[PDB]
Structures are given as structure tokens and as C-alpha cells.
């Protein structure tokens, strides 16, 4: 679900998910994928490519369970579709955390998103 | 295409179309439709509904020709899909101009688009 994804991004990056990443670059938030603009954008590219491989579940709405073992996000069992989905959300939240220092606020509100260059079908 | 649409919006409103409207409200720019926030937003809602009926061409990518008869945008060669595409774009550019008196910069970069209340069927 969008609300579990936002929780993980807030806990991993310390930033508000919607404001800092909701319109970021060519891949983060609304819209689809495009030529990634930096490391942070590449994370959202892989995450959207991750979402594309889910067959029988709705990433935006279908909820899932997850827990925290020390600093590690643990995805609880709940069908392979929701497991991979939690693993997609864990992946992007860790990814955004790992590349915080290359975050660039000049791509935060990318109002040229539809004019991004084409990308590959994942 | 988006190139002709942006040209119309610039000519009618005098504003940078991508910066001013690319992420505006719940309906303008990248993303889908949602509960409109104001009159400018409702222009984009109507325009997206207009695009929905163009099942025979690509509204974002397919180029077309237009010109001006005095102060009225005149859409050219009646290729059925491309003619109606041009008319969709002319309608929103005039709608945006006529509603500049309530344009709200607070909605310009709506990073909360995915949390907009769902819209009615077109
Ligand atoms: C990176 C943050 C992100 C997405 C990403 O992680 C991303 N890959 O862009 C994403 C998104 O992507 C999934 C998809 O397109 O279906 C769709 C919509 C919003 C999206 N926010 C912003 C957000 C997430 C959670 C709570 C509040 C705001
Ligand atoms: C309101 C302006 C607008 C769209 C609208 O007119 C609107 N109805 O939102 C729209 C758009 O809409 C079509 C759709 O979503 O399929 C999609 C993508 C960008 C869109 N920009 C911004 C823009 C348009 C043209 C040139 C440069 C920027």
C-alpha cells in the first residue's frame, strides 16, 4: 500500500515521502518511468520496474504486514504477490536511504516529467 | 501533441505551461484525474476526459497543425482523431486563460496528487 511505502521511506530517509519524492526527477511519484536524473531517481525507476512485475495484486491499495528487527525491515509472509511487493517497497526505501547525499532539490518538483527521455522496458 | 498543447497554453495564458500547470491541482499535468480543487483544475479535468474519447490516436505524441483566424484558434485537416485532439487542446488553453483570475500558486506543485479524492466517471 501507498501508506506502508510512505512509512518505510519516512523511517529510512527521514524525509516526508510525498514532498521530497512525490514529483522527483523522471521516475519518482506520479507518472511513469523515464531517463533517471540521479541515483535517487534510479531507485524510483527500479521500484516502478519492480511494480511492473507484480501480476495479481494492487501496489497502491493492497496492504501488507511488515516488522522491524533492529534496523532491518522484515517482510511478513502473505502470498508471493504481496511478499514481492513489500520487498519492492523495502528495496526502494533502502535505496533512497543509501543515496541521500546525492539527493538534489532541483529535481524535486519536475514539472517537465512528460518531457523526460524514453526508458527501457525493465 | 504536447508540443502543440503547450504552444496554445502559452499563447492564451502568457504563462510557462509546464511550470504553471504541469503539476497543478488534482488534474493538471502528469497523473490522472481527481476531485478538482478549483476552476483551473476543472479545466484540466475536462481536458483529460476529452482525451479519453480519442481512441484512434496518441494525444501526447501525435503532432497536428493549427493557426489563428483573428483571435480564434482554427484547427486544421479533419483527420477525425487529430482534429478532435486539436479541439481538446484549444478548449483547455482558453479555459485556463479565462480562469487565471483564480489561479492559485499554492496548488502549482501538488505532490499530493496520489491522495486526491477519486473523480467521477467521464
Ligand atoms: C518515492 C516515493 C513515491 C513513489 C515511488 O516510490 C516511486 N517508484 O516513484 C511513488 C509512486 O510510485 C509507485 C508507482 O508508480 O506505482 C507512486 C505514487 C507516489 C509515490 N511516491 C510518493 C509517496 C509515496 C508514499 C506516500 C506518500 C508519497
Ligand atoms: C494543463 C497543462 C498540461 C496538461 C493538461 O492540459 C491536463 N488535462 O492536465 C497535461 C497533460 O494532460 C493530458 C493527459 O494527462 O493525458 C499531460 C501531461 C502534461 C500536461 N500539461 C502540462 C504541459 C502541457 C503541454 C506542454 C507542456 C506542459
Author numbering:
A (entry chain B), B (entry chain A): 1 to 13, 15 to 53, 57 to 61, 67 to 90, 92 to 123, 125 to 133
Reproduce the article's own wording on this structure.
We have described functional and structural studies involving a toxin isolated from Bothrops moojeni venom, MjTX-II, and the inhibitor Varespladib. On the other hand, Lys49-PLA2-like myotoxins share the same general scaffold as Asp49-PLA2s, but display myotoxicity in the absence of catalysis. A hypothesis on the mechanism of myotoxicity induced by Lys49-PLA2-like toxins was recently presented, and involves several steps. It is proposed that initiation occurs by the binding of a fatty acid into the hydrophobic channel of the toxin, followed by allosteric activation and alignment of functional sites.
The crystal structure of the complex MjTX-II/Varespladib reveals the presence of inhibitor molecules in the hydrophobic channel of the toxin, interacting particularly with His48 and Lys49 residues. The structural importance of these residues was also observed by MD simulation, in which they were found to interact with the ligand during almost the whole time. Therefore, binding of Varespladib into the toxin’s hydrophobic channel is likely to prevent the membrane’s fatty acids binding and, consequently, precludes the structural alignment of the functional MDoS and MDiS regions, resulting in reduction of toxicity. Another structural feature observed was the particular dimeric assembly of MjTX-II/Varespladib when compared to other PLA2-like toxins. On the other hand, Varespladib maintains strong interactions with the same regions (Helix-I: Leu2, Leu5, Gly6 and Ile9 residues; MDiS: Leu122 and Phe126 residues; and residues His48 and Lys49), as observed in the crystal structure and MD simulations, occupying the hydrophobic channel internally. The interaction of Varespladib with residues of the hydrophobic channel forces MDiS to remain in contact with the toxin, favoring the distorted conformation. In the present work, MD simulation of the MjTX-II/Varespladib complex showed high stability and affinity of the inhibitor in the binding site on hydrophobic channel, which suggests that Varespladib prevents the interaction of fatty acids with the toxin by competitive inhibition, and also preserves the distorted structure of the toxin. In the present study, functional assays performed in mice and in cell culture demonstrated that Varespladib interacts with MjTX-II leading to a significant inhibition of its myotoxic and cytotoxic effects.
